[PDB]
């Protein structure tokens, strides 16, 4: 299958939170995983990235935890703002073109 896959879209509410599950194939177990934002795709802004271990990492309001048993890294976006809406990417860091999957984030008020 595809190196990395996730939901096509995910929704959340202001001040609430949302979680994204980025599924990857076994071979990418020991690669750093990341959550990227914006376009162009290959110029996206990295919001958080792991160190290739299962240790949870957090930067600002985003968290990332890689489960190397089920091969899925979970991204959590908290204290959601309407401005958080947009295009994001599940990604796996490697020399060259990284495996990436586009995830559209929708945010609703109140």
Curated annotation (Swiss-Prot):
Compartment list: Cell membrane
Regions of this protein lying in the Extracellular compartment: 1-110
Tissue: Expressed in myeloid cells. Present on the surface of macrophages (at protein level). Highly expressed by alveolar, splenic macrophages and bone marrow-derived dendritic cells. Expression is increased following aeroallergen challenge in macrophages, mast cells, and eosinophils.
Gene induction: Up-regulated by interleukin-4/IL-4.
Post-translation changes: Phosphorylated on tyrosine.
Domain called Ig-like V-type: residue spans: 1-106
Domain of life of the source: Eukaryota
Disulfide bonds: 22-90, 36-44
Stretches for region Plays an important role in murine norovirus (MNV) binding: 20-26
SUBUNIT field: Interacts with PTPN6/SHP-1 in a tyrosine phosphorylation dependent manner. Interacts with IL4R.
Role description: Acts as an inhibitory receptor for myeloid cells and mast cells. Positively regulates the phagocytosis of apoptotic cells (efferocytosis) via phosphatidylserine (PS) recognition; recognizes and binds PS as a ligand which is expressed on the surface of apoptotic cells. Plays an important role in the maintenance of immune homeostasis, by promoting macrophage-mediated efferocytosis and by inhibiting dendritic cell-mediated efferocytosis. Negatively regulates Fc epsilon receptor-dependent mast cell activation and allergic responses via binding to ceramide which acts as a ligand.
Designated name of the protein: CMRF35-like molecule 1
Organism: Mus musculus (Mouse)
Lineage of source species: Eukaryota, Metazoa, Chordata, Craniata, Vertebrata
Gene: Cd300lf
């Amino acid at each position: 299958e595809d190196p990395v896959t996730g939901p096509e879209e995910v929704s959340g509410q202001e001040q609430g939170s949302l979680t994204v599950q980025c599924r990857y194939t076994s071979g990418w177990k020991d690669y750093k995983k990341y959550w990227c934002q914006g376009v162009p795709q290959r110029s996206c802004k990295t919001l958080v990235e792991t160190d290739a271990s299962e240790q949870l990492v957090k930067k600002n309001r985003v968290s990332i935890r890689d489960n190397q048993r089920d091969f899925i890294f979970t991204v959590t976006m908290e204290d959601l703002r309407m401005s958080d809406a947009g295009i994001y990417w599940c990604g796996i860091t490697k020399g060259g073109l990284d495996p990436m999957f586009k995830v559209t984030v929708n945010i609703g008020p109140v």
